[PDB]
Amino acid sequence: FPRVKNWEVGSITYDTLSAQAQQDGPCTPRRCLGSLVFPPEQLLSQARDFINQYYSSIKRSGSQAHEQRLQEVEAEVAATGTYQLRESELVFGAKQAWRNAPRCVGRIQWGKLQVFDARDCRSAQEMFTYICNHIKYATNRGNLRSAITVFPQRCPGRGDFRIWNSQLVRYAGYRQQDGSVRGDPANVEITELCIQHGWTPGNGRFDVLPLLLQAPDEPPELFLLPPELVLEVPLEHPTLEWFAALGLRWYALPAVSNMLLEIGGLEFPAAPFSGWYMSTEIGTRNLCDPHRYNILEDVAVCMDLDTRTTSSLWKDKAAVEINVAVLHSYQLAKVTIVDHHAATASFMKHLENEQKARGGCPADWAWIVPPISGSLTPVFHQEMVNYFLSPAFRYQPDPW
Amino acid sequence: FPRVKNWEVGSITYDTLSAQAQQDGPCTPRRCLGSLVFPRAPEQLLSQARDFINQYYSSIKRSGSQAHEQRLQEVEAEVAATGTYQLRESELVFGAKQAWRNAPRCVGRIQWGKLQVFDARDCRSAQEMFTYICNHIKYATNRGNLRSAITVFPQRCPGRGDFRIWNSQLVRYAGYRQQDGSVRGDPANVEITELCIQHGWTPGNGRFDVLPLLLQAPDEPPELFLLPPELVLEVPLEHPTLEWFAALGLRWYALPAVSNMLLEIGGLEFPAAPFSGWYMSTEIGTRNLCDPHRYNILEDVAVCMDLDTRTTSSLWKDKAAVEINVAVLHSYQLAKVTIVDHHAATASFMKHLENEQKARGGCPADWAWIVPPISGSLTPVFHQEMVNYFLSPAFRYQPDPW
Ligand code: HEM
Ligand code: HEM
Ligand SMILES: C[C@H](O)[C@H](O)[C@H]1CNc2nc(N)[nH]c(=O)c2N1
Ligand SMILES: C[C@H](O)[C@H](O)[C@H]1CNc2nc(N)[nH]c(=O)c2N1
Ligand SMILES: CNCCCc1cc(C)cc(N)n1
Ligand SMILES: CNCCCc1cc(C)cc(N)n1
Ligand SMILES: [Cl-]
Ligand SMILES: [Cl-]
Ligand SMILES: [Gd]
Ligand SMILES: [Gd]
Ligand SMILES: [Gd]
Ligand SMILES: [Zn+2]
């Protein structure tokens, strides 16, 4: 049972939960790969395990109703080759995957999640309206609310429900007469697919991409989003009057539409989850990463900083002010957003919660520590154990 | 063989070097323990030494030669006769450079070949040990133009206890448990400070009192030695545009000299082999001064900056820490004392990884230690995947001798 220390306070815990880890991770006694991003009837083992989880949680181990539900899934797989999840189970499992996500720093919220069950979905113009309910629900005029919509569980012999975009809101990226990119370069490829499938490209740098939505075996179909449903925030700085002129914006709803929810051995390749943003996500990664918007040197010129020597820390000053603008902009617009201090402190709280409840917590240190000011947040000084619990969110190959 | 991607650029390389990982670390396929700070007969001494000698002869382009098999048999015949063996001087110099090269948590490894090696394996007493240490500090400090150096004291051997430097670094500031329940000085150093007093040191009571050395000779209690003040070069901390900053009274010392780690070379063990380089600004400005469990000046600076410390979203912590780092860089540059910032350091470490891939087919690296503790993703190492593993020769942790 791994010994885990917090170096700010000196306290020690033991991760007894780590013993359950199923899908073995990427590391070996020989080498550590913790820093790498992307490192028939077995279906009943994973469903038995999940159902046993559900009842224990509602204090219902070893009972009539516990006995009972094990048999129906036994018979369901026997006849048809899979099974259907009871409504409450799909809800319980959606929350558990979130609770189990090692790279999510906001899991103190894991118990408050709105589950839209789209399992009876049947087409692309159908898909679009489920997605469109979710978005408008979760956005809620800026008072953001966590939601996951769950589309049909994949089956053999038939195609797949998949969202071809990484997120529900994504900006375009276009090459040029010199190869380089206007717009967001994280989405250069999916932009090229959309322009291919009929979409008329804009000139702008913040063109909200049309959803490529795909129903089983039928090809994708472009689905222009209602611009009044895409809540956005123009970026301004509280005291740097010129920051607004830079013309920067980001969207309100972070909604991940390419991961594959897995409950009880069942795989839902379309299950968009959404919450709200941590400011460093926008202001540090999205805007300042060299391979993303790469605005850092432009804000430093406008601040009349000395970009000629790295020891002026001009990169660090400009970055802090870009983050201030994000928090200021979002707060002015009344869109739910949380700073990396408030958020990491709440995750520390979560770890103590999960300590008493489940005896530990899988956390990925490299993803919990924020990309600025890491050692100024408490999680920096917290040792962490990383492992895989089910149910979970998993990565999946792109549908091409 | 692990595929390793650079997310900033799109580069892809495979780490074949990891295949030869000598010892084992704490992770398994069940679970990663990478973020843990402390993750821990003649025949096996033989195959270790055999491996190092094979290394040494490869570096001098003599692999498979007369001299190469001569040394092998020499070493075997000596472990047979004595249960151990002695390194040649040139083997020792190569061994200490490799250990630097192999150290997964050092971001400064671009320099690994520029290392001055003081052979002190003839040392006899704590007193001779003290003299060797002062000569080390003197040469490395070099009046502010710092030089990388290591001093190697006698190896562990059957029949005799170890040499040990009880201090974790050659220059450390006292930490006195206080009136309330607080610490005056550096709270990382209360234990060693208690030990020095318990061994006859007359305590000071400032915040930056330099500690005496406790030097341990084989089968002897530690002996207290005071460092001559004129030999510990310090830097008063001032801010280039914030003139009230000098009234904080903060200082730091020039020479980072780690003194409690163990140098391992072809199976031989050197529990006393202190080494020194020059500081990266974040060690002082972020960690040593802003850590809540260290000098913890972050809120005091922020108030002085007239930042609004009542809400986190104003990013007062971020802004105050950036200025503390600025002050460190400026103070060391004003005082003409070598220093590298996390941007310069991480960029040069990226060249090191490129040198190492061509030379050895990879590089062992502890991501969470290489990425700076401020402005992480602003530096290029954040966006670089890394493989962490243990190669020998090596610097290892060892327990406190008390
Ligand atoms: C409500 C507030 C939430 C906040 C502030 C938050 C914050 C974050 C952040 C900062 C990341 C790192 C992502 C990156 O840097 O690429 C992350 C990852 C993740 N989050 Fe959350 N999250 C929230 C809610 C949720 C919800 C509702 C779910 C699912 C139902 C979720 C599941 C995940 C997963 C699976 C990842 C891993 C993403 C990946 O591997 O690319 N989180 N979260
Ligand atoms: C010349 C300039 C050098 C720079 C800028 C540098 C940089 C660094 C930094 C910033 C750390 C992390 C320290 C911490 O966060 O506690 C580190 C760790 C380390 N360095 Fe270097 N270094 C230098 C020279 C050297 C030399 C000369 C050696 C040995 C011969 C060495 C061996 C090590 C070791 C063993 C560690 C890990 C120590 C530990 O695990 O506590 N470095 N280095
Ligand atoms: C190479 C490195 O593992 C990679 O850049 C990771 C590090 N930590 C991260 N953490 C978060 N939250 N998001 C990321 O994209 C990354 N990138
Ligand atoms: C628990 C966590 O691993 C610990 O705080 C580490 C993180 N990374 C670090 N990185 C460096 N360079 N030095 C440190 O002391 C630490 N501490
Ligand atoms: C590249 N990351 C995509 C968006 C990540 C994310 C997802 C969620 C659900 C919340 C959040 N705060 N952040
Ligand atoms: C806990 N380590 C404290 C000193 C670390 C260190 C050591 C060396 C040799 C150089 C450096 N720049 N930093
Ligand atoms: Cl994003
Ligand atoms: Cl230090
Ligand atoms: Gd101007
Ligand atoms: Gd001033
Ligand atoms: Gd004061
Ligand atoms: Zn690992």
Give a description of the structure.
The structure is a homodimer. Chain A is an alpha+beta fold and 400 residues long. Chain A is built from ten helices and 19 strands. The first copy, chain A, has three domains: 15-119 and 146-156 and 260-274 and 344-368, no CATH class; 120-145 and 160-231 and 395-399, no CATH class; 232-254 and 277-342, no CATH class. In chain A, 32% of the residues lie in helices and 14% in strands. In chain A, β8 (211-214) and β9 (220-223) form a beta hairpin. The longest helix of chain A has 19 residues, at 314-332. Chain A starts with a strand and ends in a 6-residue tail after the last strand. At the A-B interface, β1, α6, α8 and β18 of A face β3, α6, α8 and α9 of B. β18 (386-387) of chain A pairs antiparallel with β3 of chain B, so a sheet runs across the interface. One 4-methyl-6-[3-(methylamino)propyl]pyridin-2-amine (KKU) binds next to β16 of chain B.
* Shape annotation of chain A: globular
Number of H- or I-type helical stretches of chain A: 10
Number of domains of chain A: 3
Biggest sheet features of chain A:
4 strands, mixed
Give the spatial strand order of the biggest sheet of chain A.
3-4-15-12
**Which percent band covers the strand fraction of chain A?**
5-15%
Spell the H/E element sequence of chain A: EEHHHEHEEEEHEEEEEEEEEHHHEHHEE
User: Which percent range fits the helix content of chain A?
Assistant: 25-40%
- Work out the radius of gyration of chain A: 23 Å
Q: Pairing-aware structural class of the strands and helices of chain A?
A: alpha+beta
Oligomer: homodimer
